[PDB]
Amino acid sequence: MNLHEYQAKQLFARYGLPAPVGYACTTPREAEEAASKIGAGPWVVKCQVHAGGRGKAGGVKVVNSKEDIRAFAENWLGKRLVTYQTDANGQPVNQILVEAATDIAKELYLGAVVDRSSRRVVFMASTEGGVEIEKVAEETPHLIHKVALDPLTGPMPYQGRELAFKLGLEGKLVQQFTKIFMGLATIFLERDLALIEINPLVITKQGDLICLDGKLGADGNALFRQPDLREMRDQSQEDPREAQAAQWELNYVALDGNIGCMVNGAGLAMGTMDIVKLHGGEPANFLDVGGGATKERVTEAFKIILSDDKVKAVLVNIFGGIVRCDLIADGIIGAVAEVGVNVPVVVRLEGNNAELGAKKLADSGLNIIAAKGLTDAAQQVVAAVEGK
Amino acid sequence: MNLHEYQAKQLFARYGLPAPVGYACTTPREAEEAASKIGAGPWVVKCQVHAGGRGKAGGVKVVNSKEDIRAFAENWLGKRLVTYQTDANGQPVNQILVEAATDIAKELYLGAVVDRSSRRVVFMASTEGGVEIEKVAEETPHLIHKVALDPLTGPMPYQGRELAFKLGLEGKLVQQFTKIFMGLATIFLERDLALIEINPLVITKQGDLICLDGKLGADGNALFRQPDLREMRDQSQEDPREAQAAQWELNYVALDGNIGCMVNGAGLAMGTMDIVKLHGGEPANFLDVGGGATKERVTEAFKIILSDDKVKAVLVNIFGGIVRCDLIADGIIGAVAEVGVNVPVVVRLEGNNAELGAKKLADSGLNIIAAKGLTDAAQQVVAAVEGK
Amino acid sequence: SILIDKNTKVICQGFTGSQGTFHSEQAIAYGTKMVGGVTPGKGGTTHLGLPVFNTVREAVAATGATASVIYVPAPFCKDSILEAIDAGIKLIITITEGIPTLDMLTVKVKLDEAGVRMIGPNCPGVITPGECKIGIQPGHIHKPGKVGIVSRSGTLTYEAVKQTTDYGFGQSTCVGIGGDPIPGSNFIDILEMFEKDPQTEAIVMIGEIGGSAEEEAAAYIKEHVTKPVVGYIAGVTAPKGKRMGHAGAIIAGGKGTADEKFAALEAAGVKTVRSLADIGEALKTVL
Amino acid sequence: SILIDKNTKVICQGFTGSQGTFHSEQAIAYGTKMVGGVTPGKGGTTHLGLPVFNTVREAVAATGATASVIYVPAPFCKDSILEAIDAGIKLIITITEGIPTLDMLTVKVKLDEAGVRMIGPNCPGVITPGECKIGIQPGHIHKPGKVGIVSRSGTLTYEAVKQTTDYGFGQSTCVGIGGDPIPGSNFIDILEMFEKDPQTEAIVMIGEIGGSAEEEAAAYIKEHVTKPVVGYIAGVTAPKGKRMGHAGAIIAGGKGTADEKFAALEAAGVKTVRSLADIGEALKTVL
Numbered sequence A, B: 001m002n003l004h005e006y007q008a009k010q011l012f013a014r015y016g017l018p019a020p021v022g023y024a025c026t027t028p029r030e031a032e033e034a035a036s037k038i039g040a041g042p043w044v045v046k047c048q049v050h051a052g053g054r055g056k057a058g059g060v061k062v063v064n065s066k067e068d069i070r071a072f073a074e075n076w077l078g079k080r081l082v083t084y085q086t087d088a089n090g091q092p093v094n095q096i097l098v099e100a101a102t103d104i105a106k107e108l109y110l111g112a113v114v115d116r117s118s119r120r121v122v123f124m125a126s127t128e129g130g131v132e133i134e135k136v137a138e139e140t141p142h143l144i145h146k147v148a149l150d151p152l153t154g155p156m157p158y159q160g161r162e163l164a165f166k167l168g169l170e171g172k173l174v175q176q177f178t179k180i181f182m183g184l185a186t187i188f189l190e191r192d193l194a195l196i197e198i199n200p201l202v203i204t205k206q207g208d209l210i211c212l213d214g215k216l217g218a219d220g221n222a223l224f225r226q227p228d229l230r231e232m233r234d235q236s237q238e239d240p241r242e243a244q245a246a247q248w249e250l251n252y253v254a255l256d257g258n259i260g261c262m263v264n265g266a267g268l269a270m271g272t273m274d275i276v277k278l279h280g281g282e283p284a285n286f287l288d289v290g291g292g293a294t295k296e297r298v299t300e301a302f303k304i305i306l307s308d309d310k311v312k313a314v315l316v317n318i319f320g321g322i323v324r325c326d327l328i329a330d331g332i333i334g335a336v337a338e339v340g341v342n343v344p345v346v347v348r349l350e351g352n353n354a355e356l357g358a359k360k361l362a363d364s365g366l367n368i369i370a371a372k373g374l375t376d377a378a379q380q381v382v383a384a385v386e387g388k
Numbered sequence C, D: 001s002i003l004i005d006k007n008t009k010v011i012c013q014g015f016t017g018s019q020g021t022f023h024s025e026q027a028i029a030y031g032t033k034m035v036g037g038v039t040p041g042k043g044g045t046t047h048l049g050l051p052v053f054n055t056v057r058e059a060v061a062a063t064g065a066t067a068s069v070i071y072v073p074a075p076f077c078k079d080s081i082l083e084a085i086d087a088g089i090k091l092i093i094t095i096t097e098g099i100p101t102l103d104m105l106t107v108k109v110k111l112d113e114a115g116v117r118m119i120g121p122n123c124p125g126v127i128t129p130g131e132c133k134i135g136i137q138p139g140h141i142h143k144p145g146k147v148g149i150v151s152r153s154g155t156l157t158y159e160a161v162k163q164t165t166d167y168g169f170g171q172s173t174c175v176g177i178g179g180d181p182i183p184g185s186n187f188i189d190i191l192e193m194f195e196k197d198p199q200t201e202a203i204v205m206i207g208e209i210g211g212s213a214e215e216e217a218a219a220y221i222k223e224h225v226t227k228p229v230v231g232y233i234a235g236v237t238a239p240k241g242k243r244m245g246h247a248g249a250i251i252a253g254g255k256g257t258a259d260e261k262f263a264a265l266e267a268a269g270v271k272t273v274r275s276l277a278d279i280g281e282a283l284k285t286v287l
């Protein structure tokens, strides 16, 4: 899960890492009152949304009057910010971070992720701060420096110095950088982070390192042992259907398309979306029916899939699982009536009682086709949305 | 360095490990006041000295009246306790630990050391509590169970359960034991301990694990990063000459004998003691002149070696080092006059200017023989204490 | 076949739990040589007619099992896996889903240093049709045969199983390496076993978005695999930077798309197939 | 000879510090191929006419050194050693005294996994008389020869050196494995190198109280060493449970006495000598 920038900065502060003095505000009044708490302006005001590109989208501004802070806050609070990292609907702005302006001398990049190829937490630093790091990676590889945390020893100061020297830092900046590295590496391990990104990690005109932005991603699988991080989750930042699905043991991800997919298995779910796409269809969502295809769970799945008005048909592809095909068919039938599914549903069943389940669908009289095989199921749901 | 039992118990408490309610007291008044703070008697009163065997020596008693606590405290405070683990002079008792009596059902052993053979921190558990663990090891090996902390993973719960089950613990005692293992292993790593010994680790009649005694040894080399442990050092527990030597970059250890040994090198120091022993001598001390044999350092060495009245001769064996033999000889000569060394000194010099240094000794006119070789130096200092 | 066979003796960690119970009954019914299980606190009892041990070392001493299947909840997995490695188990099949990545990071280093093989976590397990079944895959769609299957996904594998059975090819061994970012074994590890297994004549590689295991496997296949390989990558239509169910099904930093994987495999000469329904057809082609 | 020779290129970590400076001048004067040093913060300068690098990787890239000698204060050693291992250094000689045991515990595991050789810490180093000197031992008492020396102690080694030079035997290589409880290399590691080195005809093993390295070395010698071995153990008169100078010179739990070590060596057929003054005589005997 993602954290807000203000939350990443509180975490940084807890670990002695440096960030601008600032306040996360939920009302224009708090935002304007932050001005004097911070000190002499100007002040940076930032919409807090998980997505990046807030700057290009107008969500980050340097202002110099309490009046401007308040206006910015009035302008954004309760409103949604669209960036190239959100969908066209954007993320709600419920917090405005008001912080001290920083005198930037140089912009660096420091970040870490779990690298799956080397199977290590890898820190990456670059003099290319303020740019999307991926771009820099494509064009100027030689400018990205990396170190892998050794699981046996934990992060070591020499790794911090290695990156610092490769960035051409010298003097106290080397110790400062090392400190930031050791702290960030420590946070990464202790808080079970999946991602850290300080972009830009700034060298101030006064000559100090400061984290100007902060993007942290926690490993969702470790939340059971990260109580503080658990509380920081902000559901408003995501499609509410995801959490709904999750609480129902369903993995849901909305897409552009109009053919809803209900499948058991993540890989099969993606493969099913792909086969629908291959046959001229446009998948509306990814929905992995992770739990046992019970009547209730399948009903939820439909409620969730059909909460998106663009869906004109639902393809259900169940292969095995704990429930028998005939009981899954009763679940689909039941879900279709109860949810008042108003769209054609195409079903592909495999396993115990596949044909009895298919017969059950055929005999319900509901608008539900029991397909014969995957390709067939794909073609049929595709056909089913022709001209709708 | 060693910690007192009361200090080991405060540390245990900080790590959620269980120990009897108790108070370390420096006056009889505090000791008697502990009674009501603890609650209903009886109460265990324990002399706090680093050495073990305090029980057999009368330093641990269960009393049932405030009057008895006070008497015990009056009896021991400021007095020295001799145990089979101290020399005949014993250790000063400046603290009396007054704690709640514990209802013992069973006595176990749990401990850890760095095992040099496997190069791992090894925890060891046994049902043989209350016995010297070494005895149990000799006679009943099959009753000692061990686990090695894996440096890559840190202590793991299964190791705690392994020991717990081998001790035949069951039910909540297994979780309690595991907890104690994980905590003690954590303390071992975090506080850079060299040794942990809970003897006895008690299963109470009420059915809980409790640390009745606690012996902790810290790794002296890690004290630079163990500030809390650094403050806990109790110099009174050791021969004051050790700390004196140390502050002078000398490694000193007193022995029974009467031939003082001043050598540069720990191995050479021990070897020198051995060669003196081999030639009918009785080494009075181990003194490794670790720093450069400067005039001042050598003077200190003599002051320290000769602070022991049993010393009748001092053998100085210097082989190399940063100072030239002639400057070492001037140091010995100077030390001999200034310390008013009143005993014969035999010197063995090797390296730059060995013979000029020897000449220098011979020509000082001080009672200092410059020996020709190690065997010769040994025989001469041995001879020098004949009938003294 | 690879990894397991009729002779593999297996213990189950988390044996008395729901899934451990349920899938052990399934393994037993298949003829898998389950010889016992481990559940701290239940040693000395028996379950599914097998002994239950408090520790894996007790289990191993008592049964000689060399393989362990783990159905222990994620919070205790690292502990479980390390306990198995430490007890001498040489093959661990971890079914468990949701193991913290950092835990797998450490476990993976341990596994490699100790020379222990682990399939998983978050995988359906392993099955050598006719001889041994460890995991959750249904043994009722399998058929002893010549196709080796490796996959990051359970359900997709089943599709491939159905197709290779339907075409009469059959399976030598099916290995679900799991959907986590850091698995115990990756494609290359399994590919090398299939390449060196006389009974495996063709291989089906099933991957998906995220990471670069498929790309590395491609380069590996080109240079070290001679048997024909048919591959399929799920997620061509998956968005970037979004977990698609599997913790490891996420395109991080724009790298690891299904297309890049398909492309890398084609270059290494693997027979890729754009529709998962055509895996059987593609095998018929190269066989 | 073993470990080092005239061709060994060496960098010094802590090169600009007092001891690093001082002993590097000594090594340079001996002809050791010091090619540079590492001192974070002083990269780009030169010292003793050699380049100073901010990191060991810069040092290695610039010089091709395969050996590093460390004169870095104990608090930063683990960092130094790991930096060297990570930069590809294959031989580390750590002179530093006082390294936390727990640090060496971890470093030792790293060294072994990475296949890096480390002599030390808390040791005087290594010297192949005539060819290379890394450490603090005086090269003015050495003589190119046939006796290999391993010792947990600096000064005692010098005695043995003096005696083997005085008897004309000379030294192939002297290795001070150091006095710490967990050294990078122990007796058995060095014994195997001497046994396999044509130029070494006899070995002098110098141990002392504490641990069980000598006992293990004995069992090892009996079964895998054919060259004659003369041994000497210091500490027959040392009390139990008291550190005798060296962090590792302590008899813990009543085990590891000098007598037990002497005894174990005699049983394995090693020529022990009760007086350190008779090492030369004992060699003459077996040569």
Ligand SMILES: CC(C)(COP(=O)(O)OP(=O)(O)OC[C@H]1O[C@@H](n2cnc3c(N)ncnc32)[C@H](O)[C@@H]1OP(=O)(O)O)[C@@H](O)C(=O)NCCC(=O)NCCS
Pocket (backbone or CB within 6 Å): C013, C014, C015, C016, C017, C018, C019, C020, C038, C039, C040, C070, C071, C072, C073, C074, C076, C079, C080, C095, C096, C097, C098, C122, C123, C124, C125, C136, C153, C154, C155
């Ligand atoms: C691992 C998992 C299946 C466990 O679920 P579960 O069986 O319902 O959980 P339960 O609590 O019933 O059983 C867990 C058992 O492990 C036991 N256990 C816990 N720690 C243990 C340890 N270190 N060693 C052994 N057993 C342990 C528990 O005691 C419990 O047994 P008990 O009920 O007899 O006390 C589940 O958490 C999971 O990961 N599900 C997803 C699997 C999956 O989707 N894989 C993808 C394949 S495609």
Ligand SMILES: CC(C)(COP(=O)(O)OP(=O)(O)OC[C@H]1O[C@@H](n2cnc3c(N)ncnc32)[C@H](O)[C@@H]1OP(=O)(O)O)[C@@H](O)C(=O)NCCC(=O)NCCS
Pocket (backbone or CB within 6 Å): D013, D014, D015, D016, D017, D018, D019, D020, D038, D039, D040, D070, D071, D072, D073, D074, D076, D079, D080, D095, D096, D097, D098, D122, D123, D124, D125, D136, D153, D154, D155
């Ligand atoms: C290691 C030891 C010799 C260092 O002592 P020292 O040289 O006086 O200490 P100094 O401060 O002068 O030098 C240490 C240098 O290491 C440098 N250093 C610190 N961390 C470093 C690192 N990670 N990498 C490289 N160099 C580092 C310091 O910067 C300093 O150099 P500088 O003075 O140019 O800044 C000393 O602490 C010691 O261990 N002495 C006992 C040795 C011994 O008795 N061995 C037994 C052999 S028998």
